CSV table of C-alpha atoms and ligand atoms in Angstrom, one decimal:
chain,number,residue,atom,x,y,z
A,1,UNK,CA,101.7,79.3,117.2
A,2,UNK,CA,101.9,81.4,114.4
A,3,UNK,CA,100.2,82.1,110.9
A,4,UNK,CA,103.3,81.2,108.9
A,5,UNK,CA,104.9,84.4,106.5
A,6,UNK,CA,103.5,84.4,103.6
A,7,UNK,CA,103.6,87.5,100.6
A,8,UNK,CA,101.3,87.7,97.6
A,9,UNK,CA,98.3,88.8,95.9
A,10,UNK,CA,94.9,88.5,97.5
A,11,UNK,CA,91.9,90.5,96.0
A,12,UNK,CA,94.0,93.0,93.3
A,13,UNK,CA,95.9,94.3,96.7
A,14,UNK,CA,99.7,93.0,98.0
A,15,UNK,CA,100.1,91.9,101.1
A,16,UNK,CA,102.7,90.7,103.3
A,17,UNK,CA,103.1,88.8,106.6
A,18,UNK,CA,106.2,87.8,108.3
A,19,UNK,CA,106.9,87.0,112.1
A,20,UNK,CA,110.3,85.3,113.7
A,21,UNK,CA,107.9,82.6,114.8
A,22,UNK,CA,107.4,83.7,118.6
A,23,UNK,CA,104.6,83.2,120.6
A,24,UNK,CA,100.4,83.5,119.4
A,25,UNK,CA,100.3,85.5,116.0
A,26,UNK,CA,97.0,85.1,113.9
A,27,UNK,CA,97.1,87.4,110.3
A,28,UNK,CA,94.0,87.0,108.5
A,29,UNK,CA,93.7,88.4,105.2
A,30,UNK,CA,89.7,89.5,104.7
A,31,UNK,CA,88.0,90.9,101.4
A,32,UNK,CA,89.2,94.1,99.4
A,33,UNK,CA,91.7,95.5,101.1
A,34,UNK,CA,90.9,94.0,104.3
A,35,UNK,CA,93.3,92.1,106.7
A,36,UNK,CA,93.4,91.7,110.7
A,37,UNK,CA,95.8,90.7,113.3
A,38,UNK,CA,95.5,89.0,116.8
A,39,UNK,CA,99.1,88.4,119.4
A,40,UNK,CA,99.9,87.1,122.5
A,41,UNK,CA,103.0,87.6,123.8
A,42,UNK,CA,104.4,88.1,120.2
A,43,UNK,CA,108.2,87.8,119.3
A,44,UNK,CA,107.7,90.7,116.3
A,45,UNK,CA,105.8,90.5,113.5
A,46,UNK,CA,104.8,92.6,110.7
A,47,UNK,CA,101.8,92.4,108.3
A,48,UNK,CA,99.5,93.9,106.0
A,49,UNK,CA,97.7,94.9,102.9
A,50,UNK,CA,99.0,97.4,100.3
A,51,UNK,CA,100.8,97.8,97.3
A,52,UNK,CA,104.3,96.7,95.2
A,53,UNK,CA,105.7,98.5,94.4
A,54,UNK,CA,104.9,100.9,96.1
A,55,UNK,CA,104.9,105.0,95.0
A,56,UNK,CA,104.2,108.3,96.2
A,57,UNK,CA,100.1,107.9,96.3
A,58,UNK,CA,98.0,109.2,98.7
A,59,UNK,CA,97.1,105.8,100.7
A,60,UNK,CA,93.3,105.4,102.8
A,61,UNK,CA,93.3,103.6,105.7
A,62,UNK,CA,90.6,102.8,108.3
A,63,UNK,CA,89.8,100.7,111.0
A,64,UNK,CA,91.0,99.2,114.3
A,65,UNK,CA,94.3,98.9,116.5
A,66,UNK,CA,94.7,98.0,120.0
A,67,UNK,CA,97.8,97.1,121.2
A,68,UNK,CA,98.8,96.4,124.4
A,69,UNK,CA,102.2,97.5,124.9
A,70,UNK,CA,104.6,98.2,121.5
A,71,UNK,CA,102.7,97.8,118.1
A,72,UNK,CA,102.6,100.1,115.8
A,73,UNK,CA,100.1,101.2,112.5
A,74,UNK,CA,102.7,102.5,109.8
A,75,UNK,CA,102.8,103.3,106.0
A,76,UNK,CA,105.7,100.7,106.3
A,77,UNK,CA,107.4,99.7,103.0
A,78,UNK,CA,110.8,99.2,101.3
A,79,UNK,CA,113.3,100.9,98.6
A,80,UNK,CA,116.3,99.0,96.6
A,81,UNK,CA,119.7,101.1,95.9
A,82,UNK,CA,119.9,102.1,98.2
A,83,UNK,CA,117.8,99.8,100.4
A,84,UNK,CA,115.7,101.8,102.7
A,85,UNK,CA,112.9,100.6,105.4
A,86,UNK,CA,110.4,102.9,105.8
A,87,UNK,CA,107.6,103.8,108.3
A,88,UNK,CA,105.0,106.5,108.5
A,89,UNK,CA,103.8,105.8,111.6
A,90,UNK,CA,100.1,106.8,112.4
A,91,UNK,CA,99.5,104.9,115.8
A,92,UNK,CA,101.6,103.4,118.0
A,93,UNK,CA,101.0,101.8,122.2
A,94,UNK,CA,103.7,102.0,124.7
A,95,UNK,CA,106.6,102.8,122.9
A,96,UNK,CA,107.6,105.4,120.6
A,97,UNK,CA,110.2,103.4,117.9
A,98,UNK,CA,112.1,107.1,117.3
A,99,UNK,CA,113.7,106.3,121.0
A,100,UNK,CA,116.1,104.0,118.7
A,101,UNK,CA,116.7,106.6,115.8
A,102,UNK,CA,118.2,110.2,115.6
A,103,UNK,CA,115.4,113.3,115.8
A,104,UNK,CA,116.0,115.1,112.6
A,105,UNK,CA,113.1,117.4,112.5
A,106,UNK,CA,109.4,117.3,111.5
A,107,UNK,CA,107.3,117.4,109.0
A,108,UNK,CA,103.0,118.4,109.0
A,109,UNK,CA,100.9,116.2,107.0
A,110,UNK,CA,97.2,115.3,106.9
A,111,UNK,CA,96.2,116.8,109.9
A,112,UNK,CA,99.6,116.2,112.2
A,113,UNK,CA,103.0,117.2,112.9
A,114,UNK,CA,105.3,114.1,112.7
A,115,UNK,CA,108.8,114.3,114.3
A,116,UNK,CA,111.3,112.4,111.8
A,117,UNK,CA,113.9,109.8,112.3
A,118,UNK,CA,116.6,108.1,111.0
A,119,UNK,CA,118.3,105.1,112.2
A,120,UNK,CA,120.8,102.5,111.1
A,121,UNK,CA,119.9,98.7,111.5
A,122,UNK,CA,123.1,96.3,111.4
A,123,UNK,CA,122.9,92.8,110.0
A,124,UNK,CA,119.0,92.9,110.2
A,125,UNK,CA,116.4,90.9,107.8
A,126,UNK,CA,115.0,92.4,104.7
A,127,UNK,CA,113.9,92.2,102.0
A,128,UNK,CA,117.6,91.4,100.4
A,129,UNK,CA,117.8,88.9,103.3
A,130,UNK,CA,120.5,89.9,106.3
A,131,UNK,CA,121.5,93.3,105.6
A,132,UNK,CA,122.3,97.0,107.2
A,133,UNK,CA,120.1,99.8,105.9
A,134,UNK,CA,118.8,102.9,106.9
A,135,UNK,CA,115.8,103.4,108.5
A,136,UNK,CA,113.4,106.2,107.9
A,137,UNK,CA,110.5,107.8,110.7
A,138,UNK,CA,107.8,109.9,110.5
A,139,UNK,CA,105.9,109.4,113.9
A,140,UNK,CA,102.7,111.1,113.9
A,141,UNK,CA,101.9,113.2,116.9
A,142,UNK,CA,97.9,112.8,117.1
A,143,UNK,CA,97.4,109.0,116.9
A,144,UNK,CA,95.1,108.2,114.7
A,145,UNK,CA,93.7,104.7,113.4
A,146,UNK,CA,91.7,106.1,110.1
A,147,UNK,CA,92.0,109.0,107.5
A,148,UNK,CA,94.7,109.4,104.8
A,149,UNK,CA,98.5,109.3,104.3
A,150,UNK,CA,100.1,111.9,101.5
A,151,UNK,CA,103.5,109.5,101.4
A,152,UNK,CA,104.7,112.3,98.8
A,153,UNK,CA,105.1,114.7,101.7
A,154,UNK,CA,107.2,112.5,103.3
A,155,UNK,CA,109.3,111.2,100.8
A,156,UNK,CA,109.5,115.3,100.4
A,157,UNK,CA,110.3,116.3,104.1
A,158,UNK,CA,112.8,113.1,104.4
A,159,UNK,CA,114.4,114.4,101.2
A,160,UNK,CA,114.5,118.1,102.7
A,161,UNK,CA,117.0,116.2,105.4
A,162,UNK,CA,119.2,115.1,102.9
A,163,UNK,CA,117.7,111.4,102.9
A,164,UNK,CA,117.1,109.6,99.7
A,165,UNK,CA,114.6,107.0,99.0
A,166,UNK,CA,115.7,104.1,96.2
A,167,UNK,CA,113.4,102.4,93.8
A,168,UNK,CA,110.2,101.4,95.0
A,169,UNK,CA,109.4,97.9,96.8
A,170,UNK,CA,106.4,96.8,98.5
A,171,UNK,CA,104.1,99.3,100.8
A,172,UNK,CA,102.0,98.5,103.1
A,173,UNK,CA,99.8,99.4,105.9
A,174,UNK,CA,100.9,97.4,108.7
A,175,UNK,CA,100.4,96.0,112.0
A,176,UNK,CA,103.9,95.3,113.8
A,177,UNK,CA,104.3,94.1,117.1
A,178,UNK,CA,107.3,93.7,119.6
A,179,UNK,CA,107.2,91.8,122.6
A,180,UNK,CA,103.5,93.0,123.0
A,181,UNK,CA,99.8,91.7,122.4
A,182,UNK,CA,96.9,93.2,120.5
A,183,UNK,CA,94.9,93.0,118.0
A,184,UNK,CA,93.7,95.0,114.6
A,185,UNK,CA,91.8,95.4,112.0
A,186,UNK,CA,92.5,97.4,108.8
A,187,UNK,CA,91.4,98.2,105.2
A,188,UNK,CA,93.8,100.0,103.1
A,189,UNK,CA,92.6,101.8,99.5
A,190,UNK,CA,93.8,104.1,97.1
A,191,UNK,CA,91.2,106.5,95.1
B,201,NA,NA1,119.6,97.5,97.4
């Protein structure tokens, strides 16, 4: 069973949830800027607290994530014309998601190099519904569960490659799974 998707406002911050309904997924929102998330054996699943739209902000970010198997702790979030899914990834378990995108270079931020990126995802869902977009990475070398996320530098570095981000939808820090199990426990802010 699953917490069903659900988007919104809770406590001044956006959030979003959304899983394709397999196996044990539990998203609870908490206070502030608080949310945490417990799988078993999850199909995939993406949730979290943050902002929308979103915007080049330095974003907080604290707390705990342990997966077991492929999850991942991203600035994850959205642009429209052209559409764009985004991820700053800042931890991730067993798998690195870059295997399925093109290396492009890398970028240094808060207190990492991350390699970058891209990749192209046919027919997939979205925030228009079933569509094929672009996907942007930054993958952050030291994993890291707390600290802070300059998404300006890479909206920057990502533009330095000749990528361009659209207008600004929702961002989030989020807990995704694949196939995997885990747990976490987050609380984004913004100064
Ligand atoms: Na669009």
């Amino acid at each position: 069973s699953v917490t069903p998707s659900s988007t919104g406002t809770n406590n001044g911050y956006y959030y979003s949830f959304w899983s394709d309904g397999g196996g044990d997924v539990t998203y609870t929102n908490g206070n502030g800027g608080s949310y945490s998330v417990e799988w078993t054996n999850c199909g995939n699943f993406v949730g979290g607290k943050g902002w929308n739209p979103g915007a080049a902000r330095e974003i907080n970010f604290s707390g705990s994530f342990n997966p077991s198997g492929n999850g991942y702790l991203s600035v994850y979030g959205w642009t429209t014309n052209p559409l764009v899914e985004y991820y700053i990834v800042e931890s991730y378990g067993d798998y690195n998601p870059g295997t399925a995108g093109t290396f492009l270079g890398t970028v240094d931020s808060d207190g990492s190099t991350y390699d970058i990126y891209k990749a192209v995802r046919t027919n997939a869902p979205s925030i228009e519904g079933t569509a094929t977009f672009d996907q942007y990475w930054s993958i952050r070398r030291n994993h890291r569960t707390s600290g802070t996320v300059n998404t300006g530098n890479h909206f920057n570095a990502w533009a330095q490659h000749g990528l361009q981000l659209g207008t600004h939808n929702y961002q989030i820090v989020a807990t995704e799974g694949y196939q995997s199990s885990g747990s976490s426990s987050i609380t984004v802010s913004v100064d």
